[PDB]
Design a protein around this ligand. Structure first.
Ligand code: DHE
Ligand code: DHE
Ligand code: HEC
Ligand code: HEC
Lengths: 559, 559
């Protein structure tokens, strides 16, 4: 019955991180005709419903409605359910998106009817975006030959932090030692992440709208030297990290169209576009919308590591020959999202989040090694946290969006075979809604945020575990609670703390105190040795600060 | 100007070999709604138009109407053209399909309107066909354990011929020395080709409807031991031919859905389904319907060689690990169709027919090594003809559907370097409309048919060149004309001669004298040494005989 929506369509701490295709939602669409027994929506009504669908529903159900974390909603199925059921079900609204920009999920009576009617109609597929379109958008502002041959500014590049100023479609380059904002660059679109070339010279940013900008950090005044659009919705980018392939390539991953694109690392020239449409690994059924999630770069082979979400495939893409393209399509687990390499940089550990599993790939051998349930609900590691547990040896950790647990997996087949690829411990942190866990080789602490927790005090704090004191005896390791938001001294709203990121020396860890566009935000720097406040960064230009990426730690994959 | 149809839609000798999706056409489809400004068709009208479209137009324009050899006909494009233009253009008739069973390409006034209206409507994609559907159709009639452990009949299996009795969906197993039809087996729909397992024990047939049957030639009475459906439209199948992998796998290629499927070589259990939807190699644009054409098997690596037509990709699929799937996606040339391995079985030479090119792949290194224009119009080699030319060295030959030329390409990069992958000679045979060229290591003759030629005298005859008499002087080699149809003694609507195939010893070559379903056909056996008529195979059961495959020559790729 429609009342089932109370368990499926309400907001959880772990169902707020699904795609909001708000850039694609801006495209106008033609209203389809309606077959017998179905009523057509006008052009305005259809577009209104389509916008809501793309912004709020497509993340879980797909723009093509073939299903993702939520079931398929194709016309054959919806027509059988009927308008009445749909209307009653949709009245409850849908899960809220991310705080500080996402939807509340609430719908008016008029919107409810629009959505019910929209679901009964046949949807068209949004436009593709291929080479012609990419080349049209491709602009090389400063040709390689016109760029410096050595660093021309006096900045400490490796200790620089590239910070997303989300809603303003800008990034701030901040000195990691003095905390001075060296520059604020416009990208004209919300940047999702910053990635660095292996040499650390080139800064790449990917906008949610599919726009890629590459910045030359050696310039007297660093700016975008090249840009290109690779799709309509994208969230991932990475650079080549195999020795000998430094600065050779960059790769971007898109949600729509479902594809990844390999670009020249110096000019962004689009070299190879690969569709991710394909078969699910387990039921082996065609899926028309397998989104690219995290993309990492192998340190063992000249390959990119691409997570394809809906089909549960991890692709190892060899970039040594883009014409005779070698790839290894690894059957893993559905709903692959993020992950990171272990301390040795040999194994890729990734969260198939909706299924509570960690998938482990051996990047040297190019094969699946393990799939283990974390015991928690919806793991979201970011790139995770590698450390040497006093008892267990090398481990990689992840926290969860669905509960307060932190899980550790052994990552040393050679030295600790009995612990390898096994969940060794699970213990509580602040609460549910965590997004990022962090540590550094020079730190004895493990930091865990709780960004999406519904309690302001919790979402504004961070749990810190003392790795040195961990025994792994089965008890719950104690943690210190750092009042990060409180330290920032922000009066308005309930700012959420998100994502720890260390400086190059691994002596200070930064957190974003994230408030909405029309509210006050800040960055808080914590002295890692003492766990005391080091500095609070505030500036009128620091609007909606979210992701932060230290140049050195990003270029070297140190986490 | 709709009058352009006189040229665009004119029947030619080289545009009759495009897909007719007559099995898929059998599916009944519901009429879509018509958007504002468009008139709707009833379910009956739409279904009628859909059938015609799939049978006569989809081959060139695509079932999704995104274009193949003919341009896209999507609603956005057709609505701009308007009903009047479409109606007028389509009135001129479309290209005829293949002789005997293909369409005439003529429509009634009522049908013309149905088609024009159909083109203005939004088409739905035909159903997918995944693992669940394949497993539901999977039937193992005789489990491996219950099959013979040695040959239980007295047949000379290696000299046996598996002949397609087209329209009736049967195959005739015919003795290569006595010419006796040993048995006629039913599979349902028209079998397109017969392929043999590497051991020569299992005979695999693929029906145009996607039905695969595997027959155990060791049975006292050979019959199907397993069957499975792998799609709705399919034309290709092959077996594993890497030493050590005999009888391990079989692979089938489909037109719809666009995918290939690897099956267990002993039971047909479906193991891995791969979608071929993807990007075109050159302008890198997404194509939603890249059909699988020829599929060969590597003798150098445990891989299948898959031609993907519309995108111009040749896939080398490693079957040693189906979970961590390694493939090489080779950018080649669009419109890949058929081809064969050179005499050394190392290089795959294939025709990108619409572009008059021969693409050469090194199966050992897994890379493209050449793309050469044949100088002729629309090459169609079948598997081609390999021979050691007296002056040029090893060469592979192809004839053409669009003209009377025979082209020779050097196939010896190590031994005849300058001649390698270059068109060394081109000369005329009987006339245009050729489909197959053939030779055998034990023969000094090169046979060339002219099946689609408009002249009965030509379509019912074969050209024969004496390889020993070939010089490298650039002149045109003479040929003897064998009156194959005349030798058969059949007076019906100009039966067409097609496809030479040799017996095991290469001492006799067979040709099909292909007439319609309600007409008389025959197989003509020619004595290779004397080039004289040896025997004519006639039987009331021998209806629409087309493809012939000798067990030995097929299992060993001897051509
Ligand atoms: C696929 C993906 C990655 C992996 C990138 C990679 O490794 O190359 C990623 C990583 C990230 C990372 C990576 C951190 C790291 O250390 O690697 C961060 C900081 C981040 C901050 C946010 N993300 Fe993210 N994010 C999505 C997708 C993704 N986010 C979404 O689909 C979602 C849920 C909604 C949307 O439509 O964008 C979403 C919302 C957010 C936010 O609201 C965050 C908190 C703030 C913001 O700026 O948008 N995402
Ligand atoms: C993809 C493909 C192959 C390669 C198979 C492989 O390598 O495994 C092939 C091969 C073939 C071969 C392979 C010969 C060989 O020696 O390998 C033959 C005999 C053949 C006889 C015909 N083919 Fe064929 N053929 C098609 C497709 C193909 N044909 C079509 O799409 C088309 C044009 C129309 C259709 O809808 O089927 C078509 C019509 C025909 C015919 O009308 C022929 C002459 C008679 C028949 O039985 O249908 N096709
Ligand atoms: C992910 C966080 C979701 C969002 C956002 C939306 N939906 Fe959803 N929906 C989701 C789930 C988990 C389920 C239950 C079934 C399952 O997949 O486990 C649903 C179900 C529906 C239904 C009912 C379908 C049926 O009973 O067959 C409808 C009609 C539906 N969802 C509509 C819908 C719309 C219009 C949304 C945007 C306003 C939307 N959903 C968002 C998960 C998620
Ligand atoms: C391949 C042998 C074809 C068959 C069979 C059919 N069509 Fe075709 N069509 C083909 C070509 C080569 C062209 C010219 C344009 C090009 O791609 O080079 C066309 C053109 C059309 C058009 C005109 C479209 C325009 O924009 O002007 C229409 C409306 C069309 N074809 C319709 C159509 C239908 C309905 C067919 C089956 C009855 C059909 N075509 C078959 C090639 C081929």
């Amino acid at each position: 019955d429609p009342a089932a929506a109370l368990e499926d369509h309400k907001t959880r701490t772990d169902n707020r991180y699904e795609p909001s295709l708000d850039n694609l939602a801006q495209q106008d669409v033609a209203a389809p005709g309606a077959p017998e027994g179905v009523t057509a929506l006008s052009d305005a009504q259809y577009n209104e419903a389509n916008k809501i669908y793309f912004e709020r529903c497509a993340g879980c159900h797909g723009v093509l409605r073939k299903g993702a974390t939520g079931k398929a909603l194709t016309p054959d199925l919806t027509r059988d359910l009927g308008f009445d059921y749909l209307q009653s079900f949709i009245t409850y609204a849908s899960p809220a998106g991310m705080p500080n920009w996402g939807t509340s999920g609430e719908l008016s009576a008029e919107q409810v009817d629009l959505m019910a009617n929209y679901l009964l109609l046949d949807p068209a597929a949004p436009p593709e975006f291929g080479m012609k379109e990419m080349r049209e958008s491709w602009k090389v502002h400063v040709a390689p030959e016109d760029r410096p041959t050595q660093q021309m500014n006096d900045w400490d590049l490796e200790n620089l932090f590239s910070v997303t100023l989300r809603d303003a479609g800008q990034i701030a380059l901040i000195d990691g030692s003095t905390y001075e904002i060296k520059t604020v660059l416009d990208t004209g679109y919300a940047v999702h992440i910053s990635r660095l070339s292996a040499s650390g010279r080139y800064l790449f940013v990917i906008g949610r709208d599919g726009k890629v900008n590459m910045i030359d950090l050696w310039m007297k005044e660093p700016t975008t030297v090249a840009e290109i659009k690779i799709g309509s919705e994208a969230r991932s980018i990475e650079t080549s990290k195999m020795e000998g392939w430094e600065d050779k390539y960059a790769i971007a991953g898109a949600y729509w169209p479902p594809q990844y694109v390999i670009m020249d690392g110096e000019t962004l020239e689009p070299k190879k576009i690969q569709s991710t449409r394909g078969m699910t690994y387990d039921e082996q059924e065609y899926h028309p919308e397998p989104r690219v999630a995290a993309i990492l770069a192998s340190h063992y082979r000249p390959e990119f590591i691409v997570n394809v979400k809906e089909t549960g495939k991890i692709l190892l893409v060899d970039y040594t020959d883009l014409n005779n393209l070698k790839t290894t399509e690894i059957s893993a687990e559905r709903f692959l999202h993020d992950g990171g390499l272990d301390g040795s940089h040999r194994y890729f550990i990734t969260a198939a989040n909706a299924r509570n599993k960690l998938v482990v790939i051996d990047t040297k051998e190019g094969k699946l090694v393990a799939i283990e349930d974390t015991g928690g609900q919806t793991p979201h590691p970011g790139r995770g946290a590698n450390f040497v547990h006093p008892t267990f040896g090398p481990v990689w950790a992840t926290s969860h969006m669905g509960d307060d647990s932190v899980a550790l997996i052994g990552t040393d087949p050679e030295g600790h075979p009995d612990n390898a690829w096994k969940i060794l411990d699970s213990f509580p942190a602040l609460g549910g809604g965590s997004l990022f866990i962090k540590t550094h080789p020079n730190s004895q602490y493990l930091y865990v945020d709780a960004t999406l927790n519904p309690e302001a005090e919790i979402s504004g704090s961070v749990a810190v575990f003392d790795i040195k004191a961990m025994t792994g005896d089965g008890s719950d390791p104690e943690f210190k609670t750092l009042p990060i938001a409180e330290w920032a001294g922000i009066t308005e709203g309930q700012p959420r703390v998100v994502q720890g990121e260390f400086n190059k020396d691994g002596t200070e860890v930064w957190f974003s105190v994230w408030n909405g566009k029309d509210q006050e935000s800040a960055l808080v720097v914590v002295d890692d040795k003492t766990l005391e406040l080091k500095h609070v960064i505030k500036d009128e230009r620091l609007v909606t600060p979210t992701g932060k990426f230290n140049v050195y730690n990003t270029m070297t994959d140190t986490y």
